[PDB]
Write a protein that binds this ligand. Sequence first.
Ligand SMILES: Cc1cc2nc3c(=O)[nH]c(=O)nc-3n(C[C@H](O)[C@H](O)[C@H](O)COP(=O)(O)O)c2cc1C
Ligand SMILES: Cc1cc2nc3c(=O)[nH]c(=O)nc-3n(C[C@H](O)[C@H](O)[C@H](O)COP(=O)(O)O)c2cc1C
Ligand SMILES: CCCCCCCCCCCC[N+](C)(C)CC(=O)[O-]
Lengths: 116, 118
Amino acid sequence: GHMVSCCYRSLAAPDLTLRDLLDIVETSQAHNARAQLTGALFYSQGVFFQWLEGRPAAVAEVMTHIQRDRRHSNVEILAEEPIAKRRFAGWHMQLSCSEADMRSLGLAESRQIVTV
Amino acid sequence: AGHMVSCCYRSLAAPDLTLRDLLDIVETSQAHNARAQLTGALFYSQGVFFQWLEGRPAAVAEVMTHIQRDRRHSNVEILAEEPIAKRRFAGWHMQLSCSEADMRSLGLAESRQIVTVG
Ligand SMILES: Cc1cc2nc3c(=O)[nH]c(=O)nc-3n(C[C@H](O)[C@H](O)[C@H](O)COP(=O)(O)O)c2cc1C
Ligand SMILES: Cc1cc2nc3c(=O)[nH]c(=O)nc-3n(C[C@H](O)[C@H](O)[C@H](O)COP(=O)(O)O)c2cc1C
Ligand SMILES: CCCCCCCCCCCC[N+](C)(C)CC(=O)[O-]
């Protein structure tokens, strides 16, 4: 019971950008593997959802950076608790993209037909 | 009183999960969760179930007893149980992310047809 898990949800900045998501992914993947932080970040449809677990001080501090990040707002901690055993293997990223986010990147589906 | 709890778990979907199984889970859950006033959501993606459930402590603990011994998934890991003042979900629903490999496991395929229109 010498570790914590932390779980929060937040709302993306409405002007969040691909670059932003790309910065968050890259930063996230590298610091967490180094701080021994295990868990998962999900982004779908303007909402973030994240689990983190590890040393209490390493979680307490990554959450400190996260709670002041202007890339999201309304950071709502859903579960904080002493764990004795990590319940996630390393760090997992899962970003899903709807048609809305697609039209909202200038992107569209297109079928290619080539004469062969 | 009318205090409420929230429980969240992840699990591994049975390798041999079938469309019938998903039909059963959805029909059963919808019917019982409405009767027992359990709100939340079940997610399926790339072999994993994740469920969020809310309601009265006895109603959540009861459904979790059943969920935990259900042979349609294994490795049920409770991730959070927390007191809540209010529900974050209005009702209940299942959300499924369906891959090419999901399709083929269920013995299904899409086929496209071309159709004249105005
Ligand atoms: C939704 C969201 C999730 C994030 N998740 C992580 C993460 O798990 N690990 C991490 O090191 N930084 C994460 N960050 C980025 C940090 O808030 C922050 O940019 C990073 O710790 C570097 O801080 P610094 O700019 O003061 O050096 C996340 C940011 C957002 C908006
Ligand atoms: C991943 C998964 C999620 C489930 N979620 C619920 C649920 O939210 N509510 C529910 O009543 N049963 C749920 N069940 C079904 C129960 O485990 C159990 O089969 C049911 O309560 C008893 O069904 P019966 O009355 O038809 O015998 C779930 C099962 C699985 C495999
Ligand atoms: C019982 C209700 C059956 C509904 C079938 C819907 C599942 C379709 C999945 C198709 C997967 C194709 N992928 C994901 C690759 C996208 C595409 O090619 O358009």
